[PDB]
Structure formats: C-alpha cells, structure tokens
C-alpha cells in the first residue's frame, strides 16, 4: 500500500534552500515509491495521495489555492515540486486544517480500517490567530496541532532542518510525542 502524503510550506520562507531540502529528503524518498522518473501507470490503487503547498496570509488578498493533484501518478508531483514559485509569520494553520479535512474525507470515502499515515515538514515558523474559517474547526495553531495529535493518533513525525527555531519547545504540547528522535548524521533512512 504505502499511502503517504507530503506537505510543505517553507516556500516563502526559503526558496533556494527548498531545492536542497527536496534533493536531499524528498527526491530520494520519491524513488522509494517509483521505479524511476520517466510515462507511468496511474489509477485508483489506494496508494494515491495529495500535494499541498501554499503561502502565508500577508501577501494574499485574493488568492490562496491553485492546487490540482488527484493522483499525479507519482511523477507529476516531483515534476511540479521543482516548478513552483516562492512568495515573519507562516499561516501554516490554514494549510494544516485543509490537509486535515482532506485526510478526513479520504478516510470517510477511500476506506479500503485503512491505517492512514502522513508526514509534514515546514521550515517556516508558524503562528496565526485564525485556524480554519472554512469548516467546523476553530481555534489556533496550538489548538490545531493538539487536535491533530491527541484526538486521533495520526502517525506523524517531524524531521526539521539542522537549524532549530524557538518553536520545537512549544510544539511539545501534544500528548503523542513529535518523535524528533531520528536525528542522525547518516543520510535519509528509507523506513526506520
């Protein structure tokens, strides 16, 4: 199966650094789920996923979403990863809530009960007052994360860059451990 989804938001924060982050963590991981970048067969096989990357709320008075990625056949995803533009706070709460709602509708529709797994990485320091403003969810970034962690044991790990901001400490308010233990100078492990 291996139904994993990848979400990033550090585009506005770090553009050039995002390229190295990709080529060091995502591009090798992409070969774990694909026989090689060509095309390739893509259909409703359960292993399909999404691709959500957006920006912050400050420079966005009329646009927040341009996503289109039903399956991507595990090729178009890495194809548009490189081909994306770029651009304080991060407003990652909105993207996190949208991804949460998407995972919810997947579990409610793509059932077979399905051992959903996911990974999320964001280099930008997130902080914002609004949470969803689109659905029942309402709160803050802290509320959003404790909801995503405590209410449901969604398997989530955070392999942050070697630089560490003043957010890791506050991000330990979730009863499920963030599991930042995989900190090793060796290269990216396939599946620890």
């Amino acid at each position: 199966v291996a139904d994993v989804v990848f979400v990033i938001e550090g585009t506005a924060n770090l553009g050039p650094y995002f390229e190295g982050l990709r080529k060091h963590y995502l591009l090798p991981a992409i070969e774990y789920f694909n026989g090689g970048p060509p095309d390739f067969g893509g259909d409703y096989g359960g292993t399909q996923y999404s691709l959500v990357v957006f920006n912050t709320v400050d420079c966005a008075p009329e646009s927040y979403v341009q996503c289109h990625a039903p399956t991507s056949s595990a090729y178009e995803f890495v194809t548009w990863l490189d081909g994306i533009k770029f651009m304080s706070c991060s407003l990652i709460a909105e993207g996190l809530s949208t991804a949460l709602q998407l995972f919810d509708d997947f579990k409610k529709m793509r059932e077979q009960q399905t051992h959903r797994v996911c990974l999320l990485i964001c280099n930008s320091p997130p902080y914002l007052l609004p949470a969803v403003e689109s659905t029942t969810y309402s709160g803050c970034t802290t509320e959003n994360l404790v909801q995503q962690i405590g209410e449901r044991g969604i398997h989530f790990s955070i392999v942050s860059p070697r630089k560490l901001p003043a957010l890791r400490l506050l991000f330990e308010k979730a009863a499920p451990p963030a599991l930042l233990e995989p900190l090793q100078p060796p290269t990216d492990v396939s599946q620890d």
């Binding site: 026989g35 090689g36 359960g46």
Partner: peptide, 20 residues
C-alpha cells in the same frame, strides 16, 4: 504483458501494486 516486459527490462519496479 506489461509486467513481464518491465521484468525483462529490469526497471520501473516491474509495475508493482496490483492492488487495483
């Protein structure tokens, strides 16, 4: 036949995941 051709080519992960 596509799976056999992929196995003969020794690449493309032999078209895995026949789950569909």
């Amino acid at each position: 036949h596509l799976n056999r051709k992929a196995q003969n080519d020794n690449s493309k992960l032999q078209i895995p995941i026949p789950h569909s």
